Design a binder for these strands. Structure first.
Lengths: 104, 193, 70, 45
RNA sequence: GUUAAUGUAGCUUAAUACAAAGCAAAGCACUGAAAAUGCUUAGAUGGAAUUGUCCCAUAAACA
């Protein structure tokens, strides 16, 4: 019994618009699947032509869940979209006051 | 107890299916609105580029047109996944079976699962395992017996001698019921994609 | 400017598409449900047969990821 | 299925109209893309 | 054949009344995504008792 680490997916596609559709589409599927998405950040253009790469954060997975989920990505993965799987690497006033008591 | 293991291999579809007509009309609709909301001899160039498309042929979405009968070939289907399927004969049964092998406690399911990949294919085919969790289990009694159905994906296939004397048949979904009648073998669709 | 019948026809095909998409979700969810049920069913059966194998199986593979799929 | 998210549309307020072109790959495969000019196809080198 | 059956729409032990209900789910619009919000979508009591078991349709295993 072990829990997978939070793994980012770098979605690299020629067109951002197609990349955006898949990123949102996987997100909504992720939300239905109870996959938490902390961030959906986008990398800078690969200027030389250009290409667009978008990160959809995926946090939490199970061995059975991963096997079924990863395959579903294959079918969902649309025309000329390249997947990627990688392991992952200012607090406001109300938070500050609570922490002060803890460390005092 | 009679320990027997088996593997439900999966082959990715290389080329995507074409869009349905209902999608095609929707594509026109989204394109039309896109032009509306967008912010605002070339014919010879179009002719040069259109023939450039013609001269270089694209990979056929289905490589079946030439074959029409190559069940034993790894490229049975392209738009959908394939499953290895080999005839087997038992002492008390003679049925078309998913590739089966004998396993021992010394070998883990993955070790047997790896052996299934190359034992009944006697080639350098390349497949990948995602997890050790199995996908099916079916028991037939005459004496205790059990068959474990695993799952794997075919990265690439170096299937030399496509015309083997063995009866290996690649089926996506149509031939599963045709070849595997009993639920113990006709229910393989439950964990098949 | 588009005619009202043209909008009506485009709305109707959109209505068909919305109904078609609803059928897609039912088909995809049922397809996923069968896949999950089969995977869950496989979990139940072998655990009865031998829980020891699953104890090893439930352990993750550190080298499995990063995994790239086209 | 690849057709689940194949039908997509631009999500930008203001921009010059984009035209569809085919990017012919080195293995012959083709993919639809949106390009600034009304070209017909592209060739991967 | 015996089990086990599964039997208002994804869900509900909503309902049988003066309605076959509520919720989940879906499309479009709204530009980070998601959510929210507005305008839209598609539906079922197998069918009883009697409720807070048949009953045959169906039904693997028993057989």
């Amino acid at each position: 019994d072990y829990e997978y680490g939070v793994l980012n997916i770098h979605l690299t596609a020629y067109d951002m618009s197609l990349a955006e559709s898949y990123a949102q589409y996987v997100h909504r599927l992720c939300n239905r699947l109870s996959i938490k998405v902390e961030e959906s950040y986008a990398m800078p253009t690969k200027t030389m032509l250009t290409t667009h790469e978008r990160v959809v954060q995926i946090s939490g997975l199970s061995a059975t869940f991963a096997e079924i989920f990863l395959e579903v990505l294959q079918s969902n993965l649309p025309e000329g979209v390249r997947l990627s799987v990688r392991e992952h690497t200012f607090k406001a006033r109300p938070e500050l006051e609570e922490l002060l008591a803890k460390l005092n | 107890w009679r320990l027997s293991g088996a593997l439900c291999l999966q082959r990715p579809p290389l080329i995507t299916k074409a869009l349905t007509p209902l999608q095609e009309e929707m594509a026109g609709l989204l394109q039309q609105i896109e032009v509306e909301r967008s912010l605002y001899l070339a014919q010879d160039l179009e002719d040069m580029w259109e023939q450039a498309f013609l001269q270089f042929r694209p990979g056929a979405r289905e490589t079946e047109a030439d074959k029409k009968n190559d069940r034993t070939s790894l490229h049975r289907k392209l738009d959908r996944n394939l499953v290895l399927l080999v005839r087997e004969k038992l002492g008390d049964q003679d049925v078309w079976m998913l590739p089966q092998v004998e396993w021992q406690p010394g070998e883990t399911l993955r070790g047997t699962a790896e052996r299934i990949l190359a034992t009944l294919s006697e080639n350098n085919m390349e497949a990948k395992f995602l997890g050790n969790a199995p996908c099916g289990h079916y028991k037939f009694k005459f004496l205790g017996v059990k068959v474990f159905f695993f799952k794997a994906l075919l990265l690439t296939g170096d299937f030399v001698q496509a015309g083997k004397k063995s009866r290996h048949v690649w089926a996506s979904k149509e031939e599963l019921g045709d070849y595997l009648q009993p639920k113990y073998l006709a229910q393989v669709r439950r964990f098949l994609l | 400017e588009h005619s009202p019948e043209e909008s009506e026809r485009r709305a109707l095909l959109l209505k068909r598409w919305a109904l078609f998409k609803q059928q897609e979700h039912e088909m995809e969810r049922d397809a996923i449900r069968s896949m999950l049920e089969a995977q869950q069913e496989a979990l139940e059966e072998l655990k009865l047969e031998s829980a020891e194998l699953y104890a090893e199986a439930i352990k993750r593979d550190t080298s499995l990821f990063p995994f790239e799929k086209e | 299925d690849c057709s689940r998210a194949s039908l997509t549309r631009l999500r930008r307020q203001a921009y010059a109209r984009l035209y569809p072109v085919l990017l012919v790959k080195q293995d012959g495969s083709t993919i639809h893309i949106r390009y600034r000019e009304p070209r017909r196809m592209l060739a991967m080198p």
